[PDB]
Amino acid sequence: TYPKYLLSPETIEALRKPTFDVWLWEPNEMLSCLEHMYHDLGLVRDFSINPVTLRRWLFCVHDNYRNNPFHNFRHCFCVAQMMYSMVWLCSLQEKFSQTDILILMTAAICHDLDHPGYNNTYQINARTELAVRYNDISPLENHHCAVAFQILAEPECNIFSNIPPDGFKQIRQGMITLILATDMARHAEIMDSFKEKMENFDYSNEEHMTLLKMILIKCCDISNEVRPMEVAEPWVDCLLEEYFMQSDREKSEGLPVAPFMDRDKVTKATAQIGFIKFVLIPMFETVTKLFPMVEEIMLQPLWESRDRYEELKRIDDAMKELQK
Amino acid sequence: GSHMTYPKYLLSPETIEALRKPTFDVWLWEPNEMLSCLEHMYHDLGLVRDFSINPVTLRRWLFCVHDNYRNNPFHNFRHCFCVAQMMYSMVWLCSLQEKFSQTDILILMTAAICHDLDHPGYNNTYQINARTELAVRYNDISPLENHHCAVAFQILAEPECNIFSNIPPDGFKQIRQGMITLILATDMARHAEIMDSFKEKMENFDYSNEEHMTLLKMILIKCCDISNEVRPMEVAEPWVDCLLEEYFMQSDREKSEGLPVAPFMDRDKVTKATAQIGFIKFVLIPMFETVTKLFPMVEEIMLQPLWESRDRYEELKRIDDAMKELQK
């Protein structure tokens, strides 16, 4: 027997796949997983990351995620673990430099840092200190990003301490671009840009590759439904918990309420059907043009999830045919 | 030619008239007098009337804006007054009230006043290279200008300074979005991008097209911000000294901290003439030329002074070079 934070060989192997059960593990075990990713991706080797600083940095990242129902440390773990899965699934180390892999992973981990559990529309409408600070420009994502680099600026947490300044600047710019790209209000703009590049994709074109990295981090961020139904499903309850908290607050503060956060309108099936059909499937279809193996491993579960939720909605609707 | 003497902050009729033109001598006035001028602009432009601005709040607001400008050699309360006063001048010269809604004039005037709030006296490149708290906060994206705009709205969120308190929320959102766009447009890193976009619309300008009008307003605030050389020589010249003072302070600090130094800020390489010639010829003149296509009255009033300053500085340099050659 070994202290939980000693990962088993079985767990290490399972960690490479999108079927990994994100719910089984406590934070200390999740931190060890993330640690293992940096070593296993060769990032510790190639960026001379102090192994103790890596751990201190992950602990500090954990400390700066809030205990929200959804936008919490377990979410950043999911996003990073899906990114790690996609590196193996899509053979990303053939296409991307080690600096690009470092940017993808570190941005995945950092992308929702210190999230308050109320979205940008709330920040903007309530004129919060964050909205005022960032002039209504992706306030949350600007904040996640600032926090990321505030953490990295503390020497005991600086995993980049042994990278030259030019390397740091290159990584910094990449991470900012990616975390900013996680603002869903930009989803159609980013998808349109990507598809435009996808007309004639060029792996040696830097602009093409920046858009590919933004699509990968976006894929991983919104990827919960790619996972086995038993892993995916509790995430929806968590999300609706945050949505309903926000809309309750908006009501009692006299602010606009989004219909997709309305307790009397929204169900799991209504939340997921449109999202899978019109956001997730189309994005993964376009990625599958570059990476055909994504169809079987990620698009198949989405088709299955779509169909299950359509069945669910049909029974939810019937149940309400009994209620007035 | 009044009958008795009045406190300085009671503007004379002569001052009120002179205030409408780009020849206004910005150096004659103490802070309290400049505040009275700004106040007069809001009343005279009909902004107090059309937006139900409490006149006492307007004063409190202007005083709080003044308090939040730092005592920098160049990026100080007097500079904001210059930019605002040039904007006021351009409203009359270009008859902007025919083209623009009152909401638009409000955005232009208020952005002008607020555009350099709490400037630290070191530019974005310093912020970014030094990895300052501003640079980290704003993720290297126009850190100063984001900050100016944040401070503007921090002031406006205090009820005693909220000149927009009687504006409905939909009005506030429209005004806020416009001020943000304008203040962010003053980052000189974006100069060629904004000019290119504007020139593109200029191929077939449309005053009813909202994207065209947004770019026009961006060009207008940019014009006013860098408009010092449009002013009479005696008014314009001491501002060059102020600017170099900030530039040399920065390059001194960067040399000490081991950070990169920009040649245009290097006290070993820069003159008044050197500083201004290229800036006038290749930044100012071309920008005011594009504006003249929409507002041909701009040529006489604003390009002519720029041509004169260009020529005067080219002569100063020619003389500086003859001195150097004589010694070296």
Ligand SMILES: Nc1nc2c(ncn2[C@@H]2O[C@H](COP(=O)(O)O)[C@@H](O)[C@H]2O)c(=O)[nH]1
């Ligand atoms: N309806 C729905 N929205 C999701 C799902 N996963 C993520 N999202 C939305 O996409 C956003 C991604 O941004 P982030 O999680 O980085 O704030 C989430 O905040 C959430 O609003 C999902 O499974 N269903």
Ligand SMILES: CC(C)Cn1c(=O)n(C)c(=O)c2nc[nH]c21
């Ligand atoms: C153009 C830039 C490199 C230097 N620069 C500037 O930004 N502003 C605003 C000036 O007024 C100015 N005058 C000389 N150089 C200047």
Ligand SMILES: [Mg+2]
């Ligand atoms: Mg987010």
Ligand SMILES: [Mg+2]
């Ligand atoms: Mg400025």
Ligand SMILES: [Mn+2]
């Ligand atoms: Mn915490």
Ligand SMILES: [Mn+2]
């Ligand atoms: Mn997220």
Ligand SMILES: [Mn+2]
């Ligand atoms: Mn002050």
Ligand SMILES: [Mn+2]
């Ligand atoms: Mn300025």
